[PDB]
């Protein structure tokens, strides 16, 4: 503990994400909506907006 | 757990000691790196080994 | 106001042993990269300490 700040221990956590190729398993807190067809709408399919 | 010198080596496309012999990140890496000081937990005045 | 200047020449420079000498975070460089200093090489190195 008497060492300098550049020689002190540091805990490192690396989060690596797998972008969508498979069906999604980790998705955050956004509520869903009933699907509507044959109408010009904004859609959000698994984070893909359009 | 690493030291404060080697936090800059936890990055894509880096060369050093940790990047070459301990922990290598890919060149097309996507994700986040979270590093914080742990001098009060991982260190002792006699020397943590 | 009276900073020293040390000339460094006619020697083999190992820049990886600098990290064991002083407790600093970043090896901040401008014209080069700190991880590529062991392959390329120079004529003279001037060290200014203040």
From Swiss-Prot, chain C:
Q: Which domain of life is it from?
A: Viruses
Q: Quote the function comment for this protein.
A: Attaches the virion to the cell membrane by interacting with host receptor, initiating the infection. The major receptor is host ACE2. When S2/S2' has been cleaved, binding to the receptor triggers direct fusion at the cell membrane. When S2/S2' has not been cleaved, binding to the receptor results in internalization of the virus by endocytosis using host TFRC and GRM2 and leading to fusion of the virion membrane with the host endosomal membrane. Alternatively, may use NRP1/NRP2 and integrin as entry receptors.
User: How does this polypeptide assemble, per the annotation?
Assistant: Binds to host ACE2. RBD also interacts with the N-linked glycan on 'Asn-90' of ACE2. Cleavage of S generates a polybasic C-terminal sequence on S1 that binds to host Neuropilin-1 (NRP1) and Neuropilin-2 (NRP2) receptors. Interacts with host integrin alpha-5/beta-1 (ITGA5:ITGB1) and with ACE2 in complex with integrin alpha-5/beta-1 (ITGA5:ITGB1). May interact via cytoplasmic c-terminus with M protein. May interact (via N-terminus) with host bilirubin and biliverdin, thereby preventing antibody binding to the SARS-CoV-2 spike NTD via an allosteric mechanism.
Name the chain's protein: Spike protein S1
**Which species does this protein come from?**
Severe acute respiratory syndrome coronavirus 2
- Shown residues in whole-protein numbering: 351 to 400 of 1273
């Amino acid at each position: 503990p008497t060492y300098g700040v550049g020689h002190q221990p540091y805990r490192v956590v690396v989060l690596s994400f797998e972008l969508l190729h498979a069906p999604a398993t980790v998705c955050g807190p956004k509520k869903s909506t009933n699907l509507v067809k044959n109408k010009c709408v904004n859609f959000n399919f698994n984070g893909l907006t359009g | 757990v690493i030291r404060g010198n080697e936090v800059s080596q936890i990055a894509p496309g880096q060369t050093g000691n940790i990047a070459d012999y301990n922990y290598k990140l890919p060149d097309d890496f996507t994700g986040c790196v979270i590093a914080w000081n742990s001098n009060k937990l991982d260190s002792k005045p006699s020397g943590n080994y | 106001y009276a900073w020293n200047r040390k000339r460094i020449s006619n020697c083999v420079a190992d820049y990886s042993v600098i990290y064991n000498f002083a407790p600093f975070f970043a090896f901040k460089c401008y014209g080069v990269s700190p991880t590529k200093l062991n392959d390329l090489c120079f004529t003279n190195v001037y060290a200014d300490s203040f």
